[PDB]
Design a protein around this ligand. Structure first.
Ligand SMILES: [Zn+2]
Length: 271
DNA sequence: CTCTTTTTTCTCG
DNA sequence: GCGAGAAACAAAGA
């Protein structure tokens, strides 16, 4: 998932598990807890969920008085709230059991990660990750954004995917953002003029906030959290190869940029 | 059966 | 440090 999807999951979790006391924690794939599963099990069992936050694409469980469980869903991670008697599913790896139900984490590719740290280690953790600003008008400063773009020869799509210029963009929204801003994914950032950088800046914020509003892009997913999204119906280019651009009518093309599938309109996004 | 396709971080030169 | 390619891992399609 990307920022919008993670935020959707965050909101659902906040509304449903905050105030819940963890009865037990079990794992069929303990190796995904980078800080040690048995240690996390011992530390969190019996503690209560106080809140759920997010930074970039990272989900943050606030548990007990000073515990912070950092979860990254990577490519296919999915959470679901199920009954205590719910049958096990092939790719379920961890479960946080409460008195009236359980939170199950599943990940087909096993990329997702869990890390238990303390409240005062959160900010340092993200500084070490070098995560850029949240995609909001208040946090995403266009001036710094512009100076970083003017300094680099990197291609705009790969640079945006780094999470350093701004946090939250993944393959879907980076493609949607560049199409909206009329910028070709291979454009070297030092070649972007001020007006283009301004449109890009605003497009990043607008696209992601719209995606959040629509519950993210859900393309399937069972009863998993954040699976009722409607943003997928607003996608203009991602996965639209062969279809016609809604603005000019040209056929959306798909190429490979820095190893990633890339969808764009050759007319609207001049190289 | 082989090759390709679908977030983060490291290896290699 | 930087770009290119790939690995972690699983499944579905050509
Ligand atoms: Zn177009």
């Amino acid at each position: 998932p990307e920022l919008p999807e993670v935020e959707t999951v965050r909101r659902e979790l906040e509304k449903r598990i905050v105030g819940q006391k963890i009865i037990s924690i079990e794992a069929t794939y303990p190796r995904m807890v980078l800080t040690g599963f048995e240690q996390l099990k011992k530390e969190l069992t019996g503690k209560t969920i106080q809140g759920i936050s997010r930074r970039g694409k990272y989900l943050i469980f606030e548990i007990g008085d000073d515990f912070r469980l950092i979860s990254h869903l990577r490519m296919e991670g999915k959470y679901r709230l199920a009954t205590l008697d719910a049958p096990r599913e092939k790719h379920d790896h961890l479960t946080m059991k409460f008195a009236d139900g359980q939170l199950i984490y599943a990940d087909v590719r096993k990329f997702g990660t869990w890390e238990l740290i303390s409240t005062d280690q959160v900010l340092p953790y993200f500084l070490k990750k070098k995560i850029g600003p949240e995609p909001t008008y208040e946090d995403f400063d266009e001036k710094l954004f512009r100076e970083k773009l003017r300094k680099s020869t990197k291609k705009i799509k790969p640079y945006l995917l780094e999470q350093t210029l701004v946090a939250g963009l993944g393959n879907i929204y980076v493609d949607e953002v560049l199409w909206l801003a009329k910028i070709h994914p291979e454009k070297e950032t030092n070649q972007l003029i001020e007006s283009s950088i301004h449109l890009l800046h605003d497009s990043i914020i607008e696209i992601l906030q719209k995606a959040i509003k629509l519950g993210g892009s859900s393309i399937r997913t069972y009863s998993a959290l954040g699976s009722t999204g409607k943003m997928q119906n607003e996608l203009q280019v991602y996965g639209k190869t062969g279809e016609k651009c809604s603005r000019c009518g040209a056929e959306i093309q798909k190429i490979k940029v820095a190893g990633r599938g890339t969808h764009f309109c050759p007319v609207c996004q001049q190289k």
